[PDB]
Design a protein around this ligand. Sequence first.
Ligand SMILES: CCCCCCCCCCCCC/C=C/[C@H](O)[C@H](N)CO
Ligand SMILES: CCCCCCCCCCCCC/C=C/[C@H](O)[C@H](N)CO
Lengths: 278, 278, 277, 277, 277, 235, 235, 60
Amino acid sequence: ANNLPDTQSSGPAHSKETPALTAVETGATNPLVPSDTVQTRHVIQKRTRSESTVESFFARGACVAIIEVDNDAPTKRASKLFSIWKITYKDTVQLRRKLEFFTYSRFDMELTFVVTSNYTDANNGHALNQVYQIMYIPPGAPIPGKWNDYTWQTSSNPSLFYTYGAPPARISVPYVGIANAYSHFYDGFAKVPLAGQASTEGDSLYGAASLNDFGSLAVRVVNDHNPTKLTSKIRVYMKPKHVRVWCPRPPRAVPYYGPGVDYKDGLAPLPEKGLTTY
Amino acid sequence: ANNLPDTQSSGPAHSKETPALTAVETGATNPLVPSDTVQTRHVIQKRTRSESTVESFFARGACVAIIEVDNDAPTKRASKLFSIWKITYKDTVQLRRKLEFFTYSRFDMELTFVVTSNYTDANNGHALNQVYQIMYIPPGAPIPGKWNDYTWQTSSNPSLFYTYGAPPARISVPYVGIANAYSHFYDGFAKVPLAGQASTEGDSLYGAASLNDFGSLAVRVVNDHNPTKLTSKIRVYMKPKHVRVWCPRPPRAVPYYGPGVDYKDGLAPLPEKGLTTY
Amino acid sequence: NYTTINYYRDSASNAADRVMQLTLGNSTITTQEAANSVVAYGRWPEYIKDSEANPVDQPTEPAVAACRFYTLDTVTWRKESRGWWWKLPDALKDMGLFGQNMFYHYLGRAGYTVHVQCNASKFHQGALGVFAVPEMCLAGDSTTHMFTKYENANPGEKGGEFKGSFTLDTNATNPARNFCPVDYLFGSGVLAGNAFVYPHQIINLRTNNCATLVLPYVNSLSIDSMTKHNNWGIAILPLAPLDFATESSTEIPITLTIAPMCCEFNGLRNITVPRTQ
Amino acid sequence: NYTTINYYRDSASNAADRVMQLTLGNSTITTQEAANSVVAYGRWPEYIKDSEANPVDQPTEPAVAACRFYTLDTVTWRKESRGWWWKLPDALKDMGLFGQNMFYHYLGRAGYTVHVQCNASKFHQGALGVFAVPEMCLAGDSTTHMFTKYENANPGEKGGEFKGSFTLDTNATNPARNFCPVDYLFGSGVLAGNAFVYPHQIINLRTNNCATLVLPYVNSLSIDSMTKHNNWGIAILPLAPLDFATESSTEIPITLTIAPMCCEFNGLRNITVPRTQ
Amino acid sequence: NYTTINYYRDSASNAADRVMQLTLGNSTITTQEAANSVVAYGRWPEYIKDSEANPVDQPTEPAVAACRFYTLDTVTWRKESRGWWWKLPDALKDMGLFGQNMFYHYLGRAGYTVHVQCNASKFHQGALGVFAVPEMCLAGDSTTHMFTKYENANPGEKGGEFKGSFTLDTNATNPARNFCPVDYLFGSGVLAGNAFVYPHQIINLRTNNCATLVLPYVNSLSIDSMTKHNNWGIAILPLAPLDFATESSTEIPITLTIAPMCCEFNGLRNITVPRTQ
Amino acid sequence: GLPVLNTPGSNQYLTADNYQSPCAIPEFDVTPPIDIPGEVRNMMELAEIDTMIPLNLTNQRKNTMDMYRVELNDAAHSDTPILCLSLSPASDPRLAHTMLGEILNYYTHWAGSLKFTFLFCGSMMATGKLLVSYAPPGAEAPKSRKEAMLGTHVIWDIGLQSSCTMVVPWISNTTYRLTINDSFTEGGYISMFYQTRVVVPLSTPRKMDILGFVSACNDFSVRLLRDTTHISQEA
Amino acid sequence: GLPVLNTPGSNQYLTADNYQSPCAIPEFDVTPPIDIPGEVRNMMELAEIDTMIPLNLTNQRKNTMDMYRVELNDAAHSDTPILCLSLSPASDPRLAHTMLGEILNYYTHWAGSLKFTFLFCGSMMATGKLLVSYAPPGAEAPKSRKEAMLGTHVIWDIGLQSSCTMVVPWISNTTYRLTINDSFTEGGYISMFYQTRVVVPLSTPRKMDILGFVSACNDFSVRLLRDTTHISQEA
Amino acid sequence: GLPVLNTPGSNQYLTADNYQSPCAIPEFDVTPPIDIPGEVRNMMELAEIDTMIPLNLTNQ
Ligand SMILES: CCCCCCCCCCCCC/C=C/[C@H](O)[C@H](N)CO
Ligand SMILES: CCCCCCCCCCCCC/C=C/[C@H](O)[C@H](N)CO
């Protein structure tokens, strides 16, 4: 984040000290500077690594979900009057890759909700401004089965009531991990199968645990239905704040295939170029 | 920027000192004042050059781009669901001329986006309030091919989500030139053609370099299409801030013809007036 | 200057070299052609501190009984070898009293000293990258995500091998449910050439015969279940293929010796007997 | 009074005379009818300071070997002459060890002393404006923008001539791809009468025989490629046409002598051989 | 209390008695029946101060040559008179060296001493309001706005007369293009009874024979063109009609004597010869 | 939270406003500036540089290099003007396209003294005396030297020094003048006359040229920045 | 209440903004952090780690483990290059997918010195001398050792130390370079040549491999964070 | 950023309000004032000047 070191002038050298020659077998990166191999002038460095900080790298709102809801009528079976979305950053790739640069992370989160609505037909009248309810459902809490069941009382569940046309809604969340850091990767299982029990029992998905269980968001339109159908989409933008990260990893090189590290397609990411072609 | 000097009283003069007579061959402008050639009274000057400062001269939002986007349907091939605009001040003349008063400039920038939308037909229904995504694509970053491809995750690309009807969106940018100043003019090439290689290779456009490569803006409507087409235009206004300029040049006298200094038309800018006509 | 004032309670709402000897317990390792030794992330293994202890019951620290070098099965390096992987503590689950404490307790924690040994003459060629990967998740071999079963994910001291190319398991009736780690993708969809971001050492046969990696206990928790979670993964890849005097068919052994360090176990119960392959 | 408070981190977000002798190396110039000498922007040429050095490798400073006066080809001033232009360092690319250092290095930097010489009797008339233009971009001769090729943009010590009127190159099969600098537009779409905003000197034949301009190194970078980029452009225009005793057909030579100053080169490699016209 | 803070640079953005003798040059005026003398706005005429001088060239101050009383043509006050008006400096454009300096210079400035004289017996009746009006704009006589021509707007020392009623000039072929000042509208669409907001004096024939007004130079500029702009307007209206002993047909002269004061002229050139009526 | 009231002018975009905005590239490592020669802080610095006047805008001379030259000859003395200019530095065609005029065309109001510099480009053997005159406005534009000598003026002797500067002083009723052809804020008249005449010996060109330059003085200033009429765009 | 005026930019959502928001889980008891090894504060810390270069992207080698190995032999001395790279750490295919390239592809501008480390993976009995050269841009890319030795370079002796580091110094006209293939900000040319040759005794492999690694120096920096082109999503 | 609440009266234009607005001509060099005679600070100063009364408003 802070200023880089200056460059010191270097003249000709004739000595038994050989910074150029090293041994990478040790696993240590040679900390050479230009003045070690070539003659250098004095440069008072003014560049800084301020935008390379882990905070800056993640200080952007990244779309992570597009939740679709409808306001048509209870009778219509093809219209989804409410939508439940499991909270995760793995429905999108860009933030997922930036995060999976690191094994562990710990950060507060900022959720911004951009709601856009539209008509689906013209010859059924018009609609009044809609209010959307976004109810956070932590794991274990009752999940709505209908758009107007008791669960939406939100006596305890945090809930956001957004008026259409208002600026995108926004909330902040502290670090809510049950562990001391978020696990981008979990090399293990939630169950250990025990000798004796049937192959059906004890079988758990690889890499899946309750560390990444954060509940879901239930989104509905609070208004009663107008004689015409209205389709709305809530876009969720996640911004990490106060980011700490641990154990850097090589970034994803091939397309993601599911919530894990599985790959199936695009296994040839590199193009063809001659060895002696510039 | 500061106050002008006062005018000192001057009486009759009879001496061998001749400020009026000079020699412009030296290339130096004679720094005469009225009291040197005529008898003057004392005037306590109160005028100032505050609005002539380089900051004031450029402290206006100047339109530099009108980006057109549509929200009709994926099937429609005549509707452009997203638009990519290379970032430059040379699509408009007024700011371009004010800037090309100087060879070099260095400034922060303020981008203001004024979004106006309209219907294109009447007998297809109506639309809900639109959200626009303006994604900054620095050089080298993947460029969207479809309005809904992975690039719009913006995990790293800065992105602005503007709700229609909100005040014009606005962002600020630091000086992001890879050189120490912005080059309004580059008297050179990006490649030097080398003896031996074919005339196809090594050929580069005159005055074009990567100094002025700043990436582009990709603008889309995030909403799904309503049964009716909606056409939107984003107007980009650029305001230099903290302006420093170097090497003043005569302003453009003839119409601009392309990104360079080329001229083709309107080469007769001056009217006809008699030599002895007042 | 600018002014900042917080208008909320919760802070979340606020704005953003060659000769070496290693003795552990009753085990000793001597090396003469070593390329030094790497301490992963510069952190030496340590015991849980009272300021970070989650479990309340008294831990057990077998010390020398379990903090000692165990040698795994030797693998063979050929010209056609693509690489090998092991999971820790999984590779040591059948190793003396360490495995006993591992299976008798609900929670376990340990760092490691990994010593990879590969001796060859001065007329041999080849380089091995030895990488310690925290949370070394590997890709499966089926269209079903995260479908690898426990038995295959925990091979034991034998570990697994990397593959030259990805093969899809189409057997619907009896799916293999095994890993398919591709060597150049490092088994996790990442280019192997970038794997050097992990703690590592290169065994270049012209320079060194061995590699030593001191892995601290790395996890999002102070202590976890060793039977559920593999803290570390040891991946060995041929960076430069093995070659020798043009004779061909040459193969040299690679031996792996791992010593757990600072072992702590909590939650004593009846022993865990995991289901076998 | 008013109160200002910044609510953001990045500062971008904040609100807004006659007898003279010049000796360089082994070259000397004496003048008796000089109109003084102009230092462009009042800045004398200098070497890169350690506080502004981009390249890290040691520069080479040929000093007297290259910091010396080279005389270009003489041009002829007639009544019909429209003016001439040269590009620096392009005009010196074939001048002694300066050109050698220019083509052997990737980066080069130099200021200049330009001495324009035009002697005529006391019965001659005419004035020459001599202008030093940073980034002297010239307009092309085709409907294609920025289409001038490298060979024509870098004529060398001969330079180019201004034109009375703009002519469009309609040859589609074999386009000229040459400049078309119009004298009254200064070759860049700007009125020539305003060209005096640039550093300049006027040679009025009744007053002076010569002009001297000390050009500092001017660029948006501390050091650049001399083969790619021409730092300066020397433009000579007849402000007052040449005339003499009504004899007509009179023509007097104009000689140009340029000395690079404070030459610095970085990035030594094999020599660059640019493609020729 | 309330708090105010300015958030902008430019301050525009911020929130909101009887016996008297007057000697000027070689001219002297004695009065015995004076109603004192009025100094318009309480400001005595003065020369331009160095803190307010717009022109830089040395002014000329003729002093006594031009700062002296000139007597205009006498008018006759009858029972039917509606009033008279003059424009200053227009009324003095043909008065000695004052008019010469006025027409030889581009810029002129002067205050005035206006002395209106109207003597009548103790058996006469009538009152005259004498008003000094800055920027005494008068209404025209045509449907075309602002159509009065220069020749009529500058009658000279004779001035003009007010009218009882407004008459419209319908002559399209040869429009008069003259003023039509209505007495009760004060010639400018304002009730004459309010004209007393201007500096003024009343000559009541039972009290005083004369009025004296000291007009400072009043203008939005420190100095202006005297040929283009009339700084002041002198308007005389019969407030009370003239009457005498029932004889009828009585008429008494009104004489006007104006002395320019503190005359300053700038911008000497050839003389201005304005077009005549 | 804190009770607030939205005043009028909320949600408006004024291109002249001065407000803080979020940075789109936070923590960017800005390239430091180097000392580049020729820095400019004020546009009046450029307006203070002499620039050649296109004085001779006749049909055959306009839009060529001849429009800058004014031809003198060795004819007999005459009182007719050599050149006549109107002091409208922004709207006068001969002045509008000078650098001073170009800068003034970005502003609405201007005020200050000007300097006209005339350079004699005849032979060394030519001699003469000229009269450069400024007449403040109001009177008839001087048609002969006899009228012109009554205004501000300088008698220029052409000798070893071939250049002469005449300062047009700031003589205005208003504190500022407009940058358009305007009667109330008209500037005046510049004119040039032969004082004696131009005399040359034999074997010398009998016709010579003078070049005109204009610039502002250190008391010059402008205000009310506007859009110029010297550049336009199509479609 | 308090009179307020709504400036432009009100009610907008800028993904780069930095504003306080209400907490949706007030009074949450946050789990304290533990000291986890391997904390990273700057992405340049990762960019400073050597990562193997996929130098050999031929048809049969690309997207295998062979793309990282460059094969040397004991043939007679030749001046043809062993390998040729273009100094475009983000856009060059052989460099784009290194960790340095991966980090640079999230940023628009970069500046600083690089280090290329070459590891010799032949037998102990092999000896040789190589020449690793960097040519700043502008001239023809060096096609032979004779051209290459005129630029920056290091002569690497293969002995008891099998690794050599060549630092490419920061030699740029601009203070920053772009992360795309760009002519005005082109980086230069890395090349490798045989200095003498590779010599082996009998009963030794006559063909060996070198591995290439790249990393940044401590003077390296990036800016103008952007979205990378190395990851994309469908539908 | 800072949490704010929009009170009633937001987005209204009251012709009697007193608010700061952006300047459309920044850095303008304002012409200084000169001492012009006859300055008025209060309308009651004008109301304090005697003015003739149209007392006789008969038809003729
Ligand atoms: C007010 C009701 C609706 C909005 C409240 C929803 C709150 C949900 C916040 C807690 C769950 C998400 C926490 C962080 C997500 C992932 O773990 C991180 N991306 C891990 O890297
Ligand atoms: C938040 C996403 C969309 C808005 C962000 C776009 C940022 C682009 C800013 C950097 C590129 C433009 C920088 C300045 C432009 C030209 O170089 C100047 N006019 C040069 O004089």
